[PDB]
Design a protein around this ligand. Sequence first.
Ligand SMILES: CCCCCCCC(=O)Oc1c(Br)cc(Br)cc1CNC(=O)c1ccccc1[N+](=O)[O-]
Ligand SMILES: CCCCCCCC(=O)Oc1c(Br)cc(Br)cc1CNC(=O)c1ccccc1[N+](=O)[O-]
Lengths: 163, 165
Amino acid sequence: GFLELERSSGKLEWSAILQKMASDLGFSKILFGLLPKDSQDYENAFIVGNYPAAWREHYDRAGYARVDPTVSHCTQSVLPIFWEPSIYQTRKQHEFFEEASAAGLVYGLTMPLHGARGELGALSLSVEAENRAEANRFMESVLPTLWMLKDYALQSGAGLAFE
Amino acid sequence: GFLELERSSGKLEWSAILQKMASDLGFSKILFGLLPKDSQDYENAFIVGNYPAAWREHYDRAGYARVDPTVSHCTQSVLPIFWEPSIYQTRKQHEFFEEASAAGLVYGLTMPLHGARGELGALSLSVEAENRAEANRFMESVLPTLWMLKDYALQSGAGLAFEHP
Ligand SMILES: CCCCCCCC(=O)Oc1c(Br)cc(Br)cc1CNC(=O)c1ccccc1[N+](=O)[O-]
Ligand SMILES: CCCCCCCC(=O)Oc1c(Br)cc(Br)cc1CNC(=O)c1ccccc1[N+](=O)[O-]
């Protein structure tokens, strides 16, 4: 399933299944973020996951939506962006990397979300890996599954979030 | 192998690469169709693949874009729709399925495409098989690789269709 996310009964069970799927696949931290079509800000955002509260708060308070290189990437692509040194170009972006790392989120990837009704978002997952080599090996072995996952999460989440 | 789609220059080589990748996954016929954001007709569509010419012409002339259940599905979902007379209901819909079958396009699936810039389209692929059960086994066996392929085709195809000189 393949169906279990769509066949979840409400936000709570959806969130838990999503987090559990991620957990089973090997990702201890996930965040699904979705905005309605042509959103001006994040006032109508549907954001669900198990990222630490302190980090969620820090990201909001620091305005990191405007710094985070995965955000801009999502506006330009349907392909995943892996969390690697090359995506952090400016000192501001390097600072974001360091703060995310301090919060425990070092290795991972962000999958852009583009819904059939203009929904815009991202599914981010972090793996608690020993090092970059181990992180990449793990991520390669799960990537095709995660690629299907992001679209199922999008289709179901959008239905749950905006109708 | 996905890197080859960006590496290519021109509609011809790109389409050839995509067709080969699809063939390697067990699909002998494919159609990649993509419209720019908020298109009101198909005049500005980018449509490439190896569906037979006669079928392409008939589908257009008969107005099957308004009948084909995979088309309406693509406007509503990011998930694939498998080709099944179950997705047919109306008179024209069984006409459509009958004519598609006659053209040799019986089993397959359509993967909706929703681009970062509002591009809307579909990657449709047909699989040759002895029966639907076998067709389903062939398709399920490659679904994760196809899922990646459709997004790689979308990202590279949108550039080729609408952006690159
Ligand atoms: C405009 C497009 C719609 C994007 C809609 C929001 C998508 C989203 O969830 O962005 C967030 C938000 Br809101 C809060 C946090 Br905290 C994190 C993100 C996404 N970024 C990452 O997950 C990320 C990415 C790289 C490195 C570290 C991290 N991280 O947070 O630990
Ligand atoms: C508005 C969003 C759409 C986006 C528009 C692009 C989708 C597309 O390419 O539709 C077509 C077109 Br144009 C011509 C033909 Br011929 C076929 C399709 C899509 N349908 C199938 O491939 C299909 C589907 C089911 C059964 C048989 C077939 N078939 O043609 O053999």
